[model samples]
Target: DFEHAISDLEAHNQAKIGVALVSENGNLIQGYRANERFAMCSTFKLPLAALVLSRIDAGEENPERKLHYDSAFLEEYAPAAKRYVATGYMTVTEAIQSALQLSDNAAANLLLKEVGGPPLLTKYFRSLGDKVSRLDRIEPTLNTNTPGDERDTTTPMSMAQTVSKLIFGDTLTYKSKGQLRRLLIGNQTGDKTIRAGLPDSWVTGDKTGSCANGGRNDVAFFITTAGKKYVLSVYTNAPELQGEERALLIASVAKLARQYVVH
Candidate 1:
């Protein structure tokens, strides 16, 4: 029944392309066209965050370290673009907060630099078992490739694995895990896919990502009232559609997952 519902939704939106839903245990509950690579856009920040946490755990950097929000950074990345004229700075913790919560491109770019740039981050992700994940390019650089290109790629399975590591404390020291949890909890960008279908009583800490060429994407770990948890990742290449439709599609899949878990 749920698979049929997904088909109906995809058919209704002829532009719809791919979707993936996974349970808390890393099981593929439902999927359609999920293996096809789509530009991960801002969803890549989750891995970036995980890498940062790893460094913190290694004593390479402190989460409370301060990163000034200079105008130069604003000119290069999205978070800085949004707060271009502000005369304030953010700590490592706060930067992670804005990076994840606001989906601030600028903040993410800065974090990428602090974590040793894309090449290094790619190496780190691969070492952690995500061979298919990598940054598009060095920060302050954009338009290097086309959407649906393999350069900037990720899968729902990779995202779920990364989040599960963070959630279950499998990858980082306790201190770093605590910091990562705080950052995830503070995630505020809910306009994309994962948050659209759940009841208001449910709360989520998730990331939303998109680019003009890339499609809408989201990776989230949901905590229900009954103490059940679900990790989900959905990506698509329907660039012509707006954010609301993407949200609706993701919500439909989430509802299916909720029913599956409950029943």
Candidate 2:
């Protein structure tokens, strides 16, 4: 019933959608195209930041260390990272915060370099036991979003499982997990998507990304009204759709995901 409802909605929207919802106990509550890969866009920052946090917890990296960046390295539309360009430096915590909270492109790239590179991010997920997610390139290039091309993509199920582990599982220490959780909850970008569909009393945090090839994605965690917890990864690609239309589609799926869990 849950899958059919979402299928009908997808048909109406004329878009391709992949979604996965995992319960607090890590059960797959609903999985429509769960194994299919969709371009991750800025959503990859969630895991990238998680990887850096893990390193910080292990004492391999310092969160307060200041790092410099070239103005030339600033990626397009980097609202948060650009501020530090004039300052010529940003701390480890600032870069992670900018990437997760604002989806700041330059900040993400800086963190990528801090953790090695795109390959390391992919390898980090593999280390987490996720087989279907990989990051092959950095921002802007990664967001090129070729349909059916696997580079810089993740399956809905893998995204759900990976984020669930980083946010709520025992993957990271309490401080790192709490830091990531708070950053996601304070995200400024995805309020119009999955976050829009939830009740005020229900706590939810999400990371959103959109790019060429009509890719729009939101990976999120919700603490439900009854205090149950779950994670949802919703991805869609519809070149025929843009802007608000894409967001509305994701929001529709999210509302159904909440209902599916509550029932």
Candidate 3:
């Protein structure tokens, strides 16, 4: 029945999508082209979050250290909110929260800058054995010239792999692994996607990504009432629709995931 719903969405939206669900023990439960590449919008923030936490764990940065909000930085990247924190005055913890909970683009870009930019981040990612999870560039802000090119790409399979590594502590420092898990647990958006159909008692840690022309995506780690854990990632690109239509596409996929995973 759920597969029928998914097929209906594919026909209605004329969009290409990929999904993968893996259990806590690293076994695939349900999947579709999970290895194919797709654009990774704000979902890239997950890796960024891991990088910041890693630096903190290594004693190179402090979680409680403050970073002041520079007008230039804000003008270029932060959202319209006029609130200010001291330059370099914000703790790594707060930055993590802003990046994850608020999906604050400016906070993410600044964190990238603080941690030695995309090259260093990508280097670390590969060193951790995630060759497919690459960071080609930082997300653009108003103050910076948009790169004439886009390279922030990944596959649903690669995202699932990253989540697996995070959960298993195979790719990141223990401290970073713990912090990243906590931040993910607090993610505030895309509840209707991978998290929508789960039992009320279930707890989920997930991230969502989207942009005009980029696509709508959700990658999540779910814990069932019986203590089963599963990872799911969904990505779609449908340029013809906006708002509710696009939202329904995401919700529908989430519904399918819940139906299939719970069994």
Candidate 4:
């Protein structure tokens, strides 16, 4: 019955989509055979951040360390990078904030570079039991003519597990967790997606991914009025030009999920 609700939303949209919803206890709730892979987009940042936090927790990395900020990332999607006033040095703390809050491509790419690349993230994630996801490149690396450039791939449940672990599992230490929590708490992106579907007072944190043309996704952690928590990941694909519609549809799906399950 719960899965029926999820299925209806996907069927109604009539687009390529996948979703996974998890309970406060991290159990899968109403998922509609939705383990299909979708381009991860910026949503990979959450796992990337987790990997960074893992290093910080292990004393192998320092969030206060400084890195040079050149015009290293000048793609159209690098919102935070584009707003760069001048080439200068910013702390790892600053870069993490930009990547999480502003969806800055350069910030994420720099962090990815700092840690070596997708192999690090993949290794860390697998250690935590995520066996169905892949992180293949830096931001601004869109679908290309090259091999493995089609997109970074992730399944709905894999994302839900990642987000749920961000909050409910012991993936990061208290200090590292606090840092991630603070950044995600006030994410400035995807206002029309998952956040748009929630109540004004409902507290939430999320990461969004936008495919160059039309694929859209949001991975989020939610807290309900009665002190309940949940995680949901939604991925949608459509014409690259229908971004707005794609986002709205994602919001609607999230709202419907909450209505049937969260509330």
Candidate 5:
């Protein structure tokens, strides 16, 4: 079973790990602390982007509407948004691409503002029938991941469900789903996580979030060459684990999930 092997990886790396896998139809295929809460870091961008995309789908939001943020709005690790600092603006679609594909902190917060911030994301989760996810703050601040604090957290299963719904379930329209898929498949931040673990024959889209020495998360959905689809979330946290270790741990869990499904 995945439990013992997953535990071995966690212990070897001295990290706390949580994982969940769901079929395209929403069946729970595997889980380990899948209901346990863990810091979201940038992974919150997944639902945040979905919230905005849903609005776009309904025509309540415009893809080309330009958003403005000041220099004071800039957050750390915001290279994608930083390019707009001089111009002080970017299109809504650019912001979504920056936030999801690049995992840019400032870009994510800019989108958060358009969608009404952390509370709105939490509310959107509820709207999706996900009761286990919550977003309490914006980038960098939310990434703090204070010891013993539950702020800015989500359970693995909840994230997997949220991703499954947004990409494969009914949470987004055909157009928005297409848009999100394009961004996720082109993601530049998850090379060492879920994508690294899957075979190239799979078509996958994913989003990853990380907090230095704290939490590293990847939420993804992949369609095999044979057309079997699955959604999975892997979250790891250990103030003691380094970045590479955290990434390796997540990839290990993903490889196991691939085996579980294929075998």
Candidate 6:
């Protein structure tokens, strides 16, 4: 029922919505999307974060390692990154925070470069098989007509699986989990999606993605006081939806999911 209930009534009649959720056995409910593809935008950064964190756990990269801010790392999607248009340097932790919590394009590009670009990231993703998503390119690349829309794509379920594994699956190390959780809870962005819509006792850690005419997407895992966990992955397409509209659609579906999971 949440499928069309969020249909454009909130976005000025110009949005196509897709949602996928896995509810805990406690309240048990399910939602769907067409298993289709949509531009993932910055959400692909989740796996990138995973790869980065894994390197930290292995001692190859230290969390406090110093990284310089180069204008070359800036992408069209970042405003804060531009603040450092000259030259700057910050620790690995700050860069990770900039990417995950703030959705800063330059910070993410810097991190992607550290991970050896898309090939290595894809290699780690392929290890999980169906549980992880394959991203052909990094952000700001496919957000335009130059790279074509299909260069980077993901579905709602794939989004959910990626986030879920980060939280509950064995794909990441304990240190990696701790570092990721800290960065997530510190998220300064994504107030409208899973963050704003969840219940009182429920707390969430998530990553969000948005493109002008591309799509608005979020993937998250929230835990209730009772230890029940729910993962929601949702995507809304076309720019006609605008900012608040796309966010409201995500929050609406998330609210319905809360009812199904909270009991």
Candidate 2: tens digits of C-alpha lDDT, residues 74-103: 877798778878888889999999999888
lDDT of model 4 at residue 121?
A: 79
Scored by lDDT, model 3 comes in at: 0.71
lDDT values for all models: 0.68, 0.89, 0.71, 0.77, 0.86, 0.72
Clashing pairs for model 6 are: none
Better of 1 and 4 by TM-score: 4
Summarize candidate 1's per-residue lDDT along 70-103 as a digit string, tens digits: 6756744565346533755667776677777777
Ordered from best to worst TM-score, the candidate numbers read 2, 5, 4, 6, 3, 1
Off by over 4 Å in 4: 1-13, 83-87, 142-151
Which regions of candidate 2 deviate over 4 angstroms?
none
Model 4 C-alpha lDDT versus the unseen true structure: 0.77
Task: Quote model 2's TM-score.
Answer: 0.97
Predictions ranked by lDDT, top down? 2, 5, 4, 6, 3, 1
User: What does candidate 5's lDDT look like per residue over 1-263, in tens digits?
Assistant: 78998888878778888999998876788999999888888889988888999999888999999899888988768887788889989899999999988888888888989999888899999998999889887778888776667888888998898888888887788888888888899999888899889998899899998875577889989999888889999988866876787787788889988887863
Query: TM-scores, in order shown?
Result: 0.85, 0.97, 0.85, 0.89, 0.96, 0.86
Cα displacement (Å) at residue 7, model 5:
1.2
- Across 192-261, the per-residue lDDT of candidate 3 in tens digits comes to 6666755658777888877656377888887788777777888887777776666677767766777776
The candidate that achieves the highest lDDT relative to the unseen native structure: 2
Tens digit of lDDT per residue, candidate 6, span 170-235?
668987887787777777767878778887667788888886574788887888888887778777
Model 3 residue 99 lDDT score: 77
lDDT of 5 at 4: 95
Top candidate when judged by TM-score against the true structure: 2
